[PDB]
Amino acid sequence: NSNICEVCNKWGRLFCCDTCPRSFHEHCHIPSVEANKNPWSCIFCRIKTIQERCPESQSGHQESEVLMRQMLPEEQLKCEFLLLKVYCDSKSCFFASEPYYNREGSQGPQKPMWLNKVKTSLNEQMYTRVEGFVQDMRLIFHNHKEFYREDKFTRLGIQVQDIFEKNFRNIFAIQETS
């Protein structure tokens, strides 16, 4: 196995996947690494199994159809993995915890949002459709762009949104377009 966490790239108290060489901090994995379960398979492995059991699940889909899906176990897993892929980028630190807004010439967003809030919401089964999760994720970046205006810091929103959107197209097999 790897000797660093796949998500944050630090050593520490690591749980090792039994079916691949990845390792994780307890709360870096999503869902948090399960108490018992020998063997244990990480989220990467669980997602790969879905694809292998239903190869046709990789044919292209329309985003509008994916968003209306109910959050059954496979869609719950897919959103957890997508959230994890965002946390894998170090620039997610800016969006992880609860923000506050006091900048001359700007007003804070009406509906603040952050990664750890989305994480709790997924854990508590608060989303009934994929749309709920995707809306909250896109709201993080939209709030950031609106608040920071012309400050160059706005670019961090664009950057982390791009990681989100590329991973959303990959995980949910969104039909490729120009």
Q: Does residue 42 belong to the site contacting Zn ion (CB under 5 A)?
A: yes
Q: Does residue 33 belong to the site contacting Zn ion (CB under 5 A)?
A: no
Which lies closer to Zn ion via its Cβ, residue 28 or residue 160?
28
Which lies closer to Zn ion via its Cβ, residue 88 or residue 139?
88
The interface region with Zn ion, picked from 53-61, 76-84, 124-132, 150-158 by CB under 5 A, is 53-61
The interface region with Zn ion, picked from 42-50, 63-71, 125-133, 156-164 by CB under 5 A, is 42-50
Per CB under 5 A, the list member of 25, 29, 85, 144 interacting with Zn ion is: 25
Per CB under 5 A, the list member of 4, 16, 20, 96 interacting with Zn ion is: 20
CB 17 within 8 A of CB 29: no
Q: Does residue 71 belong to the site contacting Zn ion (CB under 5 A)?
A: no
| 7 vs 30: CA distance, rounded Å | 10
Q: How far is CA 101 from CA 57, 97, 111, 176, in A?
A: 42, 13, 12, 37
| 85 vs 7: CA distance, rounded Å | 8
Report, in Å, the least distance between residue 101 CB and Zn ion.
28
Tokens representing residue 174 in the block: 């969104």
- Rounded to the nearest 10 degrees, what angle do helices 73-87 and 130-148 cross at? 30
CA-nearest of 21, 66, 69 to 41 is 21
- Positions touching Zn ion (CB under 5 A) are 5, 7-8, 17, 20, 22, 25, 28, 42, 44-45, 54
